[PDB]
């Protein structure tokens, strides 16, 4: 049976980058030819494995993360990058294998006056360990004063909206990302090309 990529890429709403979803792909054929001939997919960068040769490889399983970020942060979804995304929201490991698809979604995930509910993490006590999601919303102690449950000066709340308007530039419009990941282990293989 064919790959169920129609339920990952063509979903109607994605998760925000501080709390993303991870789906498992198993028992299928990895037909990327329904996906690769979509040339407005403005980024198809592949670390670890090479593009256009995916259909002649056998794998164990495929994990497909999903979130939305603005266009100035797509260079941060990569092994070994920094910023206010790859240290506070979603950090890939250094020896990661998998392609990082990223296209433009300014018609889809954008509306007038902001679309206020795609959050992102501003403050954390330390940088993220790799593949660590973070959903906790306790207030961040910036200075030295423990304020204990009420925010103000030197203790803020660590989530702001993205405020996506369709009249921004090419850099501030929502670039919807899917970063698939591949794994190989000593086991029977359920995901391979035709």
């Amino acid at each position, epitope marked *: 049976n064919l790959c169920p990529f129609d339920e990952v890429f063509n979903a109607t709403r994605f998760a925000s980058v501080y709390a993303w979803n991870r789906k498992r792909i198993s028992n299928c054929v990895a037909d990327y030819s329904v996906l690769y001939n979509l040339a407005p997919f403005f980024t198809f960068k592949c670390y670890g494995v090479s593009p256009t040769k995916l259909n002649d490889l056998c794998f164990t399983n495929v994990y497909a993360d999903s979130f939305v970020i603005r266009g100035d942060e797509v260079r941060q979804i990569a092994p070994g990058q*920094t910023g*206010n995304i790859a240290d506070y929201n979603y950090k890939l490991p250094d020896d990661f294998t998998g392609c990082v698809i990223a296209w433009n979604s300014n018609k889809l995930d954008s509306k007038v006056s902001g679309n206020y509910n795609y959050l992102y993490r501003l403050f954390r006590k330390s940088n993220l360990k790799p593949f660590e999601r973070d959903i906790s919303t306790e207030i961040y102690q910036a*200075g030295n004063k423990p304020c204990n449950g009420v925010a*103000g*000066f*030197n203790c*803020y*709340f660590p989530l702001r909206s993205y405020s996506f308007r369709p009249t921004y530039g090419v850099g501030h419009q929502p670039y919807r990302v899917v970063v698939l990941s591949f794994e190989l282990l000593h086991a029977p293989a359920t995901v391979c090309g035709p």
Partner: antibody
Amino acid sequence: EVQLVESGGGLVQPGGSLRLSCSASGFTFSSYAMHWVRQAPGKGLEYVSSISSNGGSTYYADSVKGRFTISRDNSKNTLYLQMSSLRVEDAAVYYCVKHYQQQLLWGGPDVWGQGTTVTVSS
Amino acid sequence: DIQMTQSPVSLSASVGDRVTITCRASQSISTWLAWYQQKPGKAPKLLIYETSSLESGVPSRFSGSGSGTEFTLTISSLQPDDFATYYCQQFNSYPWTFGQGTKVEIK
């Protein structure tokens, strides 16, 4: 164009009181949150006081706390730093500083005001 | 309450040079820092904001960089309209500690 004029100051005996008024509209005022900074003549800059967006919570500096009281009539489009129990060190220019953003993830003041001065002598 | 240092404290440069100024903090902030220019006799004004972006109203001969404990404001080409002193400012923790100053002297 954002405009910031402020008024007050002059001369005072050591131990007196002043009203330093930072009052200029130039924008939608009630949403912002503006602060105070100071600079002794011939010295570096210094931060003294700040206020919230609604006048709720203030935060004073380390060496100034207990002696001042910042207040703001947000409808009157005015900002008051009310001096009390000053010393010789407080002879400076007091500028007004306006915040950049609307209300959260505070930092990075946007524009500075014109400036009033105060002096101490006997 | 972060005691910012600033280097240098004074310098003499003419038109057609490249001066880099550093402002190094003790407590590690992360890209919460501006830069200031103060003409003597009137108020300072915002030059760059959040250590990378540029405010409207300035030629692009200045540039901000750096993230972490050390930042570099660089001036690519000098001009005869830069006869002032400069200030860095952190705003991560809320007692704002401005720098010292760097007098740019022309000769």
